[PDB]
Design a protein around this nucleic acid. Sequence first.
DNA 1: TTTTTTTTT
Lengths: 589, 589
Amino acid sequence: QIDYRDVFIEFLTTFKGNNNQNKYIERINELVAYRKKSLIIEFSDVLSFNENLAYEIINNTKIILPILEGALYDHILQLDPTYQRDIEKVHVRIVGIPRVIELRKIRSTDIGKLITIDGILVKVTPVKERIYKATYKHIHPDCMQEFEWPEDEEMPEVLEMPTICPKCGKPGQFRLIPEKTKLIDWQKAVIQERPEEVPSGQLPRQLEIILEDDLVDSARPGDRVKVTGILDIKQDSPVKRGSRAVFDIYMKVSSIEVSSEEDEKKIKDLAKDPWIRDRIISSIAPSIYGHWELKEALALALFGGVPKVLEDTRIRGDIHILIIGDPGTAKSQMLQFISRVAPRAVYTTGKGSTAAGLTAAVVREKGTGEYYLEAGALVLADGGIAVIDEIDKMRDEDRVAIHEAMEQQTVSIAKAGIVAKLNARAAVIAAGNPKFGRYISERPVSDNINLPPTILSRFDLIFILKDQPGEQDRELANYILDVHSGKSTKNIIDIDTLRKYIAYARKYVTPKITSEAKNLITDFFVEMRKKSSETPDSPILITPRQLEALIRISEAYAKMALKAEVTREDAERAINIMRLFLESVGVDM
Amino acid sequence: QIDYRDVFIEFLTTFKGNNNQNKYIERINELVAYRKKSLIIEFSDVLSFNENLAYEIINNTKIILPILEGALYDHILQLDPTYQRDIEKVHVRIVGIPRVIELRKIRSTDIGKLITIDGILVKVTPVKERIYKATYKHIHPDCMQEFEWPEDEEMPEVLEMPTICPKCGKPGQFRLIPEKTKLIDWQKAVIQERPEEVPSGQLPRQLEIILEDDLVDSARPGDRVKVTGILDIKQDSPVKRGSRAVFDIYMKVSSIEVSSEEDEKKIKDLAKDPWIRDRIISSIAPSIYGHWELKEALALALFGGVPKVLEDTRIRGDIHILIIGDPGTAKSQMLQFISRVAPRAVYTTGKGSTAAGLTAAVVREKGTGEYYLEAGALVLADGGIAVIDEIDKMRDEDRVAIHEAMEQQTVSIAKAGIVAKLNARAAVIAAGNPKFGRYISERPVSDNINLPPTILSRFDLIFILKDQPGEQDRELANYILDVHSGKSTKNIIDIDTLRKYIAYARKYVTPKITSEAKNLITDFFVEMRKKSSETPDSPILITPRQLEALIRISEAYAKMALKAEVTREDAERAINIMRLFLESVGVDM
DNA sequence: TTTTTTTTT
Ligand SMILES: [Mg+2]
Ligand SMILES: [Mg+2]
Ligand SMILES: [Zn+2]
Ligand SMILES: [Zn+2]
């Protein structure tokens, strides 16, 4: 009756964007440039342009989608005839569907229609190949005939061989020819519901999703995704009877998105403020009163330094923080916020974690009895932040397992005939209590901390928190009561904007040390060593690691302002913050 | 369409190398002399000669390799008819394909094409036999007929039996005839992607490869390889249905490289410089300031001594080094460099290693239920170097398991009805911290080291590193900042050249001890022992092993300069380095 | 059962 082929073509070439630039024309041209084969379409734009087409897509997806894909191919084909013989067909993916269903609310009425699901990826299988059009040869001394079996039909997910030879009308034995068989990429992944959606008491549930063609390897485990596609039932051996007419549910993904130009200008405008550093610092844990030096230190760990990769060695660029404090000083509240604003973070505790779970585990799969590696907490946090609450409660024989990952940023395993090395480039933030629960001033600093000097040298900054009831109790009491009353602080960057800001900085900014910063850093390091040698009593050691901590911190300060060079101003701040760190552990500079 | 037989023969006989020596002519003669049945052709040579031929090999590989193989066979057979009846057919292997694809980015479009993958070898199976042309016998009271079942076609990967007897056109049951069956060698290996190309937060992937004919047993596990061949889908159980329309992929290897005259010329001229020893020492860990004695000791372990094999016993020729130091003294950075410059090295840590994993593991195969052995780190490092970081962090019950491999260089297993003895000729490099993290000067050496005297006696050299701040801080700070600023030290042999130099020295050099060096070593050992008896409380003991250490070190010094005899000078250097080791551990000389 | 890495009484 009505053809949407023209409307779809009209929509793509005639659609004014936010800045009136025909964004979809630009997207198509970018697709031809690198042969992307996949085009992303916003549902809202289709609804804004022509509503009638929008309902057709969301309600008749299984029919109208192949029609649009063919129409798009011709339009691209006209733009570039050379697009052939490298790409044979394209894919149209739709995002922004309003039909969002919780993973626990799926019922029979939701099967067969395009829906959207939000969850967490937990398992990804290696990419494999699926046959969708096989080629067979009849093994019968008369035939020697080659044919494609699923004629006029895509081969189903259950393989089936012909029973009668089409070219001779005889039964017999058929042989598959891999050379003439058509294949498509295939990957299986498992999604899990968010903890915020799990009801009280029960464990989270899981759903199986299938990724095909270019959708494979689109995300890594631990990511938060929004999948869109068609639900369907799952079968393994339909021929194998014995009742059991009960089937599971699997999700046939058509478009996946993880976690725009408008953000860049929004981010770029933020960096133009001269007081951007102070605004960022004041935006860390707005619900916590005071602890200005601690808030500043946590900001540095989020940005980090510049890792240096050389032809012979590599230098760690991550910043590690240690906090020791009396109970009730909001150590854990701050760590919770960090795991929320960090683009990638893993939260663990000292008691609830083991040496094998922190780095890597060797397990025997019951399917084959063969040992294989399992990623640990530090490995999964690669490129992110690892948070280790209650570090003092962790067994010492287990805590030593992270010494290598803290400095060399690798995990080495030699167990059960498996020798492997895994990257663990993650920043470690840890908190804990002193030896006797509360800090005791009479005893020396050495026995209060109760940690080996080997692990203390691996932390760039160490802060000791003391809860002394003084004149600020009234200020603290009023601040807390305001939080419980719903009153909040304004003129602070929200979490979502801040998370976008940090991710941009860690990807496009790489400061360089200038000569002016070199002299200041060198002079202060020499001063450190002389002071430390004078008093060989403090439990901390001024090793060459402390010199590199100055370099890492200096780059982080420059990175927070999206600067390209480490000026003298950043060097002074880096020296200043470590002066406070040294004062905390009782070293007077 | 033009015949390429003449062009291929023309290229073989008329190609001029760097010296215009007709290199491939020499290769054919070597092939004829040794009956090697395999030819290696560099792709870039073919492209330079005839670009049209090079393209055809890349693209039309399925139906052009047998054509060239036949043409080459006739040329060889014409050259020497005696080559026939010894070699039925020859193989042409092409090396240097421009099409290189990472293991993780293989898609359906790459199946059926000649591609190159570079990875790490992991597992190798014993050589087996594959039937490529069967010979059955229709046993039926009237038939008694035998025949080659797959007619005018190679036997497929799937074992299939005839249904109708060709000699009588009747059904029945058939019996295989092993005597008349044709077989071909067959080996299965597993390759793994390199650690430097694994994406962040993910475990490495694996690919299955198949080696046939002379390609079997071309490499050992742990080797870095570059394989070239055709990808294909893998079929395991296609007789029974049940979906499973998803297939894995494997590789049909055509040519394999592991890890020349020009290099040997480069190495030879390097040793001509009288100061070659100092150049090599200065080239060890260029990013680390100072530690000249440590750098020199590490160079010796790279080269090693001369193992002696006698009719009654054998004496090890490897050098073991132990480093004890305060945290932050860059012990791990040097060990990382050693694992990268050595021709063969295995890197492990104290905490991430087990007694079974270091030497050998007994694992029960689930398929058959019988135990079998798996090679540990020391076995895999045979003929190379084993690096054990954080030696003091492993449990003493596990550390004691390497006493035999450290001296006798063998691993003995009496477990689960398996009695075996494996060679573990590997040099051990170890590092660790003192008992209290940092070295305590007031306490003696016995309580600082915290290791049993048995394992200490097995180490040729022991160096204690102390981090004392002093006047060298300013130069140390400047050196580190220059490294971070990108400045590089010149007059340094690069890693690749240095690795080639070490491999050549360990292979073609075997120094002999002269009389002059004999007298010097004897006098020092006697004088060393006499002073040892004066203070018997030291944890170190001057056993007869230390006499062997002097011999091994002296040979290593001679081997560093590609000398053939241990002159007087090399004995002097060996004594001096021993004095530093003794003086460092607290024994004056 | 017997050897192995792992969390658990
Ligand atoms: Mg807490
Ligand atoms: Mg170390
Ligand atoms: Zn037929
Ligand atoms: Zn017959």
